[PDB]
Design a protein around this nucleic acid. Structure first.
Length: 88
DNA sequence: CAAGGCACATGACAACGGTGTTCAGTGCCGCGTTGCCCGATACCCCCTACCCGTAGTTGACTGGCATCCGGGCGCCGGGTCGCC
């Protein structure tokens, strides 16, 4: 998608291939998000009972997880579950 | 005895007496209005102290919560699956 964003002309087939791999990356993103939805529910339960509805805390944890995924990469030699909980 | 001569007073004649009025000019005391002079007060500036919003923090850590019955009472009204 970075290459697609550039104004320089790319012939259409390679641009479509770039879009396809970008869509596959988005699907991987969604897979990771659904994988850790369980993580945030436990973390939100870790903070329930303080004037905020449990499902509202779960949604806010979902937002934090979205941030963590958008800022997570394998360059760190650690699992995702360790890096996520801080941002959650 | 009648006519002509001299005294005192007399028809007017202005000008003083004394006092009252005229324009006018200017003040003389009463009532009210005005420039100062300051003094405080709103209103620009500079400085830093502290409130408040945003963004990171990497061992691992991946599904909870306690409900709820002793109304009571009846009806409406619809759903809901058997029934033959």
């Amino acid at each position: 998608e970075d290459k697609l964003a550039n104004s320089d002309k790319l012939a259409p087939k390679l641009k479509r291939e770039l879009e396809i791999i970008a869509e596959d990356g988005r699907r991987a993103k969604n897979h990771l998000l659904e994988a850790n939805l369980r993580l945030v529910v436990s973390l939100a339960k870790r903070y329930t009972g303080r004037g905020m509805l449990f499902l509202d805390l779960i949604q806010e944890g979902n937002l934090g997880l979205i941030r963590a995924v958008e800022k997570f990469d394998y360059t760190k030699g650690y699992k995702f579950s360790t890096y996520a909980t801080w941002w959650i």
